[PDB]
Amino acid sequence: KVFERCELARTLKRLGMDGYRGISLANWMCLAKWESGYNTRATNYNAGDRSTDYGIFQINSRYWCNDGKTPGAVNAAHLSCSALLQDNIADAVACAKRVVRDPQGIRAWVAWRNRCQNRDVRQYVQGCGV
Template sequence: MKAFIVLVALALAAPAFGRTMDRCSLAREMSDLGVPRDQLARWTCIAEHESSYRTGVVGPENYNGSNDYGIFQINDYYWCAPPSGRFSYNECGLSCNNLLTDDITNSVRCAQKVLSQQGWSAWSTWKYCDGSLPSINDCF
Protein backbone atom coordinates (compact mmCIF):
# COMPACT_ATOMS: atom_id res chain seq x y z
CA MET A 1 0.00 0.00 0.00
CA LYS A 2 2.85 2.37 0.86
CA ALA A 3 4.39 1.81 -2.59
CA PHE A 4 1.05 2.58 -4.23
CA ILE A 5 0.80 5.89 -2.35
CA VAL A 6 4.34 6.79 -3.43
CA LEU A 7 3.52 5.98 -7.06
CA VAL A 8 0.32 8.03 -6.99
CA ALA A 9 2.22 10.95 -5.47
CA LEU A 10 4.88 10.66 -8.18
CA ALA A 11 2.26 10.52 -10.91
CA LEU A 12 0.60 13.66 -9.59
CA ALA A 13 3.88 15.50 -9.08
CA ALA A 14 5.46 14.46 -12.38
CA PRO A 15 3.83 17.14 -14.55
CA ALA A 16 5.34 19.77 -12.26
CA PHE A 17 8.84 18.84 -13.40
CA GLY A 18 8.18 17.65 -16.93
CA ARG A 19 7.42 19.43 -20.14
CA THR A 20 5.17 18.83 -23.09
CA MET A 21 6.93 18.73 -26.41
CA ASP A 22 5.48 18.53 -29.89
CA ARG A 23 6.35 16.34 -32.84
CA CYS A 24 8.86 18.75 -34.36
CA SER A 25 10.60 19.80 -31.14
CA LEU A 26 11.07 16.12 -30.25
CA ALA A 27 12.36 15.28 -33.74
CA ARG A 28 14.84 18.17 -33.66
CA GLU A 29 16.15 17.33 -30.17
CA MET A 30 16.50 13.66 -31.04
CA SER A 31 18.34 14.59 -34.23
CA ASP A 32 20.67 16.81 -32.19
CA LEU A 33 21.33 13.78 -29.96
CA GLY A 34 22.41 11.77 -33.00
CA VAL A 35 19.29 9.69 -33.60
CA PRO A 36 19.19 8.68 -37.28
CA ARG A 37 16.78 10.82 -39.25
CA ASP A 38 15.08 7.79 -40.76
CA GLN A 39 13.95 6.75 -37.25
CA LEU A 40 12.53 10.10 -36.15
CA ALA A 41 9.00 9.64 -37.52
CA ARG A 42 8.74 6.34 -35.61
CA TRP A 43 10.06 7.83 -32.38
CA THR A 44 7.70 10.79 -32.56
CA CYS A 45 4.78 8.45 -33.21
CA ILE A 46 5.70 6.32 -30.19
CA ALA A 47 6.04 9.40 -27.96
CA GLU A 48 2.69 10.72 -29.16
CA HIS A 49 0.88 7.48 -28.34
CA GLU A 50 2.79 6.60 -25.16
CA SER A 51 2.87 9.96 -23.36
CA SER A 52 1.31 12.64 -25.58
CA TYR A 53 4.85 14.06 -25.83
CA ARG A 54 5.02 14.66 -22.05
CA THR A 55 8.36 14.04 -20.35
CA GLY A 56 7.05 13.84 -16.78
CA VAL A 57 4.56 11.01 -17.14
CA VAL A 58 4.52 7.96 -14.87
CA GLY A 59 2.10 5.43 -16.29
CA PRO A 60 -0.39 3.44 -14.25
CA GLU A 61 0.68 0.18 -12.70
CA ASN A 62 1.11 -2.67 -15.16
CA TYR A 63 -0.15 -6.22 -14.61
CA ASN A 64 3.17 -7.21 -13.00
CA GLY A 65 3.35 -4.24 -10.61
CA SER A 66 5.82 -2.27 -12.75
CA ASN A 67 5.36 1.26 -14.08
CA ASP A 68 6.44 3.08 -17.23
CA TYR A 69 8.32 6.39 -17.17
CA GLY A 70 8.86 9.43 -19.32
CA ILE A 71 8.17 10.46 -22.87
CA PHE A 72 8.72 6.91 -24.20
CA GLN A 73 7.13 5.15 -21.19
CA ILE A 74 10.15 3.02 -20.34
CA ASN A 75 9.40 0.13 -17.99
CA ASP A 76 10.96 0.11 -14.53
CA TYR A 77 11.16 -3.68 -14.20
CA TYR A 78 13.69 -3.99 -17.00
CA TRP A 79 15.21 -0.63 -17.83
CA CYS A 80 15.44 1.78 -14.86
CA ALA A 81 15.53 1.71 -11.06
CA PRO A 82 12.14 2.67 -9.60
CA PRO A 83 12.05 5.19 -6.74
CA SER A 84 10.23 2.61 -4.60
CA GLY A 85 13.42 0.53 -4.42
CA ARG A 86 11.58 -2.46 -5.90
CA PHE A 87 13.78 -4.89 -7.86
CA SER A 88 14.73 -3.87 -11.39
CA TYR A 89 17.17 -5.26 -13.92
CA ASN A 90 17.99 -1.58 -14.60
CA GLU A 91 19.50 -2.29 -18.01
CA CYS A 92 19.90 1.44 -18.67
CA GLY A 93 21.77 1.94 -15.38
CA LEU A 94 19.76 4.91 -14.15
CA SER A 95 16.99 5.97 -11.83
CA CYS A 96 13.55 6.12 -13.41
CA ASN A 97 13.31 9.70 -12.14
CA ASN A 98 16.05 10.56 -14.66
CA LEU A 99 13.51 9.75 -17.39
CA LEU A 100 11.08 12.40 -16.14
CA THR A 101 13.16 15.52 -16.62
CA ASP A 102 13.02 18.30 -19.22
CA ASP A 103 16.34 17.02 -20.62
CA ILE A 104 15.39 14.03 -22.78
CA THR A 105 18.95 12.72 -23.19
CA ASN A 106 18.52 9.85 -20.70
CA SER A 107 15.14 8.92 -22.18
CA VAL A 108 16.52 8.86 -25.70
CA ARG A 109 19.60 6.81 -24.77
CA CYS A 110 17.55 4.31 -22.79
CA ALA A 111 14.89 4.06 -25.53
CA GLN A 112 17.66 3.38 -28.06
CA LYS A 113 18.88 0.55 -25.84
CA VAL A 114 15.37 -0.89 -25.65
CA LEU A 115 15.13 -0.67 -29.44
CA SER A 116 18.48 -2.39 -29.95
CA GLN A 117 17.53 -5.28 -27.66
CA GLN A 118 13.81 -5.72 -28.33
CA GLY A 119 12.95 -3.85 -31.51
CA TRP A 120 10.09 -1.43 -32.09
CA SER A 121 7.50 -3.92 -30.87
CA ALA A 122 8.76 -3.39 -27.31
CA TRP A 123 6.24 -0.53 -27.23
CA SER A 124 2.60 -1.61 -27.05
CA THR A 125 1.68 1.40 -29.20
CA TRP A 126 3.88 0.16 -32.03
CA LYS A 127 0.76 -0.94 -33.91
CA TYR A 128 -0.01 2.76 -34.51
CA CYS A 129 3.51 3.48 -35.73
CA ASP A 130 4.19 0.56 -38.05
CA GLY A 131 4.03 1.25 -41.76
CA SER A 132 3.94 4.57 -43.52
CA LEU A 133 4.09 7.69 -41.34
CA PRO A 134 3.99 11.39 -42.17
CA SER A 135 7.39 12.84 -43.02
CA ILE A 136 9.25 14.83 -40.38
CA ASN A 137 11.07 16.86 -43.04
CA ASP A 138 8.89 19.91 -42.35
CA CYS A 139 10.38 19.99 -38.82
CA PHE A 140 13.84 20.92 -40.11
Protein backbone atom coordinates in the same frame (compact mmCIF):
# COMPACT_ATOMS: atom_id res chain seq x y z
CA LYS B 1 7.87 19.45 -20.14
CA VAL B 2 5.26 19.07 -22.83
CA PHE B 3 7.17 19.36 -26.16
CA GLU B 4 6.05 20.91 -29.44
CA ARG B 5 6.11 18.52 -32.42
CA CYS B 6 8.90 20.07 -34.56
CA GLU B 7 11.02 21.13 -31.57
CA LEU B 8 11.07 17.49 -30.42
CA ALA B 9 11.71 16.19 -33.93
CA ARG B 10 14.70 18.50 -34.20
CA THR B 11 15.82 17.56 -30.68
CA LEU B 12 15.83 13.80 -31.35
CA LYS B 13 17.66 14.45 -34.62
CA ARG B 14 20.38 16.22 -32.65
CA LEU B 15 20.59 13.23 -30.29
CA GLY B 16 21.31 10.83 -33.14
CA MET B 17 18.00 8.95 -33.28
CA ASP B 18 17.44 9.14 -37.07
CA GLY B 19 18.12 5.78 -38.69
CA TYR B 20 19.27 4.37 -35.39
CA ARG B 21 18.95 0.55 -35.56
CA GLY B 22 17.05 1.02 -38.82
CA ILE B 23 14.53 3.35 -37.03
CA SER B 24 13.57 6.63 -38.75
CA LEU B 25 12.87 9.85 -36.88
CA ALA B 26 9.29 9.62 -38.14
CA ASN B 27 8.90 6.33 -36.22
CA TRP B 28 10.46 7.79 -33.05
CA MET B 29 7.92 10.63 -33.25
CA CYS B 30 5.10 8.14 -33.74
CA LEU B 31 6.20 6.11 -30.74
CA ALA B 32 6.69 9.14 -28.44
CA LYS B 33 3.45 10.62 -29.73
CA TRP B 34 1.39 7.58 -28.81
CA GLU B 35 3.33 6.75 -25.65
CA SER B 36 3.23 10.09 -23.81
CA GLY B 37 1.84 12.58 -26.29
CA TYR B 38 5.32 14.19 -26.04
CA ASN B 39 5.17 14.74 -22.23
CA THR B 40 8.29 14.06 -20.13
CA ARG B 41 6.27 13.87 -16.85
CA ALA B 42 4.13 10.97 -18.18
CA THR B 43 3.91 8.17 -15.58
CA ASN B 44 1.79 5.00 -16.04
CA TYR B 45 1.39 2.43 -13.25
CA ASN B 46 0.68 -1.20 -14.25
CA ALA B 47 -1.35 -2.56 -11.30
CA GLY B 48 -1.31 -6.10 -12.68
CA ASP B 49 2.41 -6.69 -12.73
CA ARG B 50 2.94 -3.56 -10.54
CA SER B 51 5.44 -1.84 -12.86
CA THR B 52 5.61 1.76 -14.03
CA ASP B 53 6.29 3.28 -17.44
CA TYR B 54 8.32 6.54 -17.28
CA GLY B 55 8.70 9.65 -19.46
CA ILE B 56 8.43 10.61 -23.11
CA PHE B 57 9.14 7.05 -24.22
CA GLN B 58 7.25 5.43 -21.30
CA ILE B 59 10.23 3.28 -20.21
CA ASN B 60 9.35 0.40 -17.82
CA SER B 61 10.94 0.15 -14.38
CA ARG B 62 11.22 -3.65 -14.47
CA TYR B 63 13.72 -3.82 -17.31
CA TRP B 64 15.55 -0.50 -17.89
CA CYS B 65 15.32 1.80 -14.86
CA ASN B 66 14.74 1.28 -11.19
CA ASP B 67 12.31 2.91 -8.76
CA GLY B 68 12.84 0.44 -5.92
CA LYS B 69 9.12 -0.36 -5.67
CA THR B 70 8.91 -2.70 -8.68
CA PRO B 71 8.67 -6.44 -7.87
CA GLY B 72 11.12 -8.72 -9.71
CA ALA B 73 13.38 -5.93 -10.98
CA VAL B 74 16.78 -4.55 -12.09
CA ASN B 75 19.20 -3.63 -9.26
CA ALA B 76 19.87 -0.11 -7.88
CA ALA B 77 23.23 -0.10 -9.75
CA HIS B 78 21.33 0.96 -12.88
CA LEU B 79 19.80 4.26 -13.95
CA SER B 80 17.15 5.75 -11.67
CA CYS B 81 13.70 6.12 -13.17
CA SER B 82 13.66 9.75 -11.96
CA ALA B 83 16.19 10.55 -14.71
CA LEU B 84 13.42 9.79 -17.23
CA LEU B 85 11.11 12.50 -15.86
CA GLN B 86 13.41 15.47 -16.47
CA ASP B 87 12.78 18.21 -19.05
CA ASN B 88 16.03 17.34 -20.83
CA ILE B 89 15.53 14.03 -22.68
CA ALA B 90 19.15 13.04 -23.31
CA ASP B 91 19.04 10.21 -20.71
CA ALA B 92 15.67 8.86 -21.90
CA VAL B 93 17.15 8.91 -25.37
CA ALA B 94 20.20 7.03 -24.15
CA CYS B 95 18.03 4.37 -22.55
CA ALA B 96 15.76 4.30 -25.62
CA LYS B 97 18.67 3.35 -27.86
CA ARG B 98 19.53 0.57 -25.43
CA VAL B 99 16.06 -0.92 -25.30
CA VAL B 100 16.01 -1.31 -29.11
CA ARG B 101 19.36 -3.01 -29.60
CA ASP B 102 17.55 -6.13 -28.29
CA PRO B 103 16.39 -8.15 -31.39
CA GLN B 104 12.68 -7.13 -31.37
CA GLY B 105 13.90 -3.57 -32.02
CA ILE B 106 11.10 -1.02 -32.08
CA ARG B 107 8.43 -3.82 -31.69
CA ALA B 108 9.36 -3.46 -28.01
CA TRP B 109 6.54 -1.02 -27.53
CA VAL B 110 3.22 -2.65 -28.18
CA ALA B 111 1.81 0.85 -28.80
CA TRP B 112 4.15 1.25 -31.81
CA ARG B 113 2.80 -2.04 -33.25
CA ASN B 114 -0.81 -1.00 -32.80
CA ARG B 115 -0.40 2.58 -34.14
CA CYS B 116 2.89 2.85 -36.08
CA GLN B 117 3.74 -0.48 -37.67
CA ASN B 118 3.46 -0.74 -41.50
CA ARG B 119 1.97 2.74 -41.96
CA ASP B 120 2.85 6.16 -43.38
CA VAL B 121 4.40 7.90 -40.35
CA ARG B 122 5.53 11.04 -42.25
CA GLN B 123 2.86 13.33 -40.75
CA TYR B 124 4.93 13.31 -37.60
CA VAL B 125 8.03 14.87 -39.16
CA GLN B 126 6.03 16.93 -41.64
CA GLY B 127 7.54 20.37 -42.17
CA CYS B 128 9.97 20.18 -39.22
CA GLY B 129 12.96 20.73 -41.52
CA VAL B 130 14.99 17.67 -40.52
